[PDB]
Amino acid sequence: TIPHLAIDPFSLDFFDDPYPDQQTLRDAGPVVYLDKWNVYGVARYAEVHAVLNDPTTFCSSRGVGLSDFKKEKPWRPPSLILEADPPAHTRPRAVLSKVLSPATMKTIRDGFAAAADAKVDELLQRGCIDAIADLAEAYPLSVFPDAMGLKQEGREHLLPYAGLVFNAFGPPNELRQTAIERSAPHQAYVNEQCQRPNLAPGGFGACIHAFTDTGEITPDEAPLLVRSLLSAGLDTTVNGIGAAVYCLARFPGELQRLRSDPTLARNAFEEAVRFESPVQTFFRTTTREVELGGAVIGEGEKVLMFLGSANRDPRRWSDPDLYDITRKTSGHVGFGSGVHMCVGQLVARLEGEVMLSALARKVAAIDIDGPVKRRFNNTLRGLESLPVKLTPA
Ligand code: HEM
Ligand SMILES: CCC(=O)c1ccc(C(=O)O)cc1
Ligand SMILES: [Cl-]
Ligand SMILES: [Mg+2]
């Protein structure tokens, strides 16, 4: 009843151009079986949304990677928020929701916006830049470690550790085993900065520790929640901002619409998250036998969700392969959906908005003027290098 496909969604050829294989996965049926890895797959919007909003059947406490925590040891202690289910998930989620709250955004907005303005003006003085290293990486590195309250020493471990984290959600292919092998120095740096004495008061990390007073998390839970922000809050925004610049460089008509109304900056970033989906895939594990799309999935089966594919499903989106900065983007699953929907989404949108705002006001054109290089990751989609010319407005 369920089609069996040999597509490997964690192969380099898939990463290089996933869109044809993603249509094949969508059009094969609402639920497929991937013989390469012995997992179920869902690539249409309807089933991806359905699975995300059914947490009691499609759980996260057995891992959101390919590995089943009931069968193998997690490569690091399980995340208290990402790799937990209600009710254990709820109070740690509430802490991160308050730490990264709308109220908190007010305290960082001016510095985040000023840093974005300064970066774009700095890059315009150079003319020909790398939009990844000099922008998509440089800007988040200039604001997010500070906002976490991290010390200066050791920040060079942050992007390598995040790449390891997201490669580890994948199957035990070379990308994953290369990342986990000899990863101890990255783990040691991160785990050390998660301890309260190393976090600047007033920053995100110290505020998590401050919530141990409330009864919402214990002192021994706070370092692991600091770890969550250091795992999920940097590389994702790097790929998201790079995707937005990539979209504006490819769709000059949309850059010009953004220039003419910089208040479209926030939705221009949101559409970039839908269009490129920095987080492409992750898993759930069935807690019971379950019917999904006419398909009977047994207990303890891994289900792979294609977020990027769901964000391009023509069953849901008109002209899904067009970047449209006035598209009604509400409902895309680039940040997930349901109880686990990205708790740092306000931080991501703040960075993206103020960067695209700076571009909208200061830049007249963005022209690719060098070889474009893709960055390969089992779960993250993004570029390694994006040489562009910036023309000042
Ligand atoms: C463009 C940027 C980002 C994207 C595309 C993104 C994507 C996602 C997605 C798809 C999920 C859901 C995972 C699941 O359902 O299993 C998620 C969860 C999460 N994200 Fe983000 N994220 C971004 C930025 C951030 C930032 C800036 C932070 C922290 C400052 C962050 C921290 C987290 C955490 C802690 C979770 C776990 C939430 C939970 O399980 O309840 N992310 N993210
Ligand atoms: C889709 C994966 C993701 O974005 C993420 C990764 C790690 C953590 C964590 O360490 O809790 C949370 C979310
Ligand atoms: Cl770690
Ligand atoms: Mg010390």
Nearest CA to ligand 2 atom 6: 232
The response to whether 128 counts as a known ligand-binding position is no
Q: Which two tokens stand for residue 276?
A: 């490129």
Number of domains in the chain: 1
What is the sign of the dihedral through the CA atoms of 218, 224, 226 and 228?
A: negative
C-alpha–C-alpha distance, residues 265 and 60, integer Å: 33
- The resolution in angstroms reads 1.7
What is the sign of the dihedral through the CA atoms of 367, 371, 377 and 378?
A: positive
Asked if 231 and 255 count as a contact pair (C-beta separation under 8 A), the reply is no
Within 6 A (CB) of ligand 1 lie 60, 64, 81-82, 93, 96, 100, 228-229, 232-233, 236-237, 240, 273, 278-279, 282, 334-336, 340, 342-344, 347-348
For the Cβ of 80 lying below 6 angstroms from any atom of ligand 2, the answer is: no
Pocket test for ligand 2, best of 99, 164, 165, 335 (most atoms within 8 A of CB): 165
For the Cβ of 282 lying below 6 angstroms from any atom of ligand 2, the answer is: yes
Phi and psi, residue 176, nearest 5°: -75, -45
The response to whether 62 counts as a known ligand-binding position is no
* Radius of gyration for the alpha carbons in the chain, expressed in angstroms and rounded: 20
CATH number for the domain that contains residue 244: 1.10.630.10
Provide the CB-side half-sphere exposure for 31 (13 A, CA).
18
Sheet containing 58-59: order of strands: 4-5, 32-34, 39-42, 302-306, 281-286, 58-59
CA of 151 to the centre of ligand 4 (A): 10
C-alpha–C-alpha distance, residues 38 and 21, integer Å: 18
Kindly give, in sequence order, each residue whose CB lies less than 8 Å from that of residue 310, ignoring residues fewer than 6 positions away. Answer: 43, 44, 45, 48, 49, 316, 333
Pocket test for ligand 2, best of 79, 100, 306, 381 (most atoms within 8 A of CB): 79
Nearest CA to ligand 2 atom 4: 232
What is the sign of the dihedral through the CA atoms of 162, 164, 169 and 173?
A: positive
* Of 53, 19, 4, 15, nearest in space to 379 by CA: 15
C-alpha–C-alpha distance, residues 59 and 102, integer Å: 28
Position in ligand 1 atom list of the atom nearest CA 84: 40
* Of 228, 217, 238, 166, nearest in space to 194 by CA: 228
**Side chain identity, residue 57:** T
Kindly give, in sequence order, each residue whose CB lies less than 8 Å from that of residue 214, ignoring residues fewer than 6 positions away. Answer: none
Q: Which two tokens stand for residue 270?
A: 């949101």
User: Which numbered ligand comes closest to the C-alpha of 236?
Assistant: 1
The response to whether 381 counts as a known ligand-binding position is no
C-alpha–C-alpha distance, residues 236 and 234, integer Å: 5
User: Which numbered ligand comes closest to the C-alpha of 58?
Assistant: 1
The response to whether 342 counts as a known ligand-binding position is yes
Buried b (16+ CB within 10 A) or exposed e, 264-293: bbbbbbbbbbbbbbbbbbbbbbbbeebebb
Domain that holds residue 100: 1-393
The response to whether 349 counts as a known ligand-binding position is no
C-alpha–C-alpha distance, residues 75 and 77, integer Å: 7
3-class secondary structure for the chain? CCCEECCCCCCHHHHHCCHHHHHHHHHCCCCEEECCCCEEEECCHHHHHHHHCCCCCEECCCCCCCCCCCCCCCCCCCCCCCCCCCCCCHHHHHHHHHHCCHHHHHHHHHHHHHHHHHHHHHHHHHCEEECHHHHHCHHHHHHHHHHHCCCCCCHHHHHHHHHHHHHHCCCCCHHHHHHHCCCHHHHHHHHHHCCHHHCCCCCHHHHHHHHHHHCCCCCCCHHHHHHHHHHHCCHHHHHHHHHHHHHHHHCHHHHHHHHHCHHHHHHHHHHHHHHHCCECEEEEEECCCEEECCEEECCCCEEEEEHHHHCCCCCCCCCCCCCCCCCCCCCCCCCCCCCCCCCCHHHHHHHHHHHHHHHHHHEEEEEECCCCEEECCCCECEEEECEEEEEEC
- CA 236 to centroid of chain Cα atoms: 4
User: Which own/partner pairs from 143-146 qualify as long-range (CB within 8 Å, at least 24 positions apart)?
Assistant: 143/108, 143/111, 143/112, 143/115, 143/351, 144/233, 144/234, 144/237, 144/347, 144/351, 145/234, 146/203
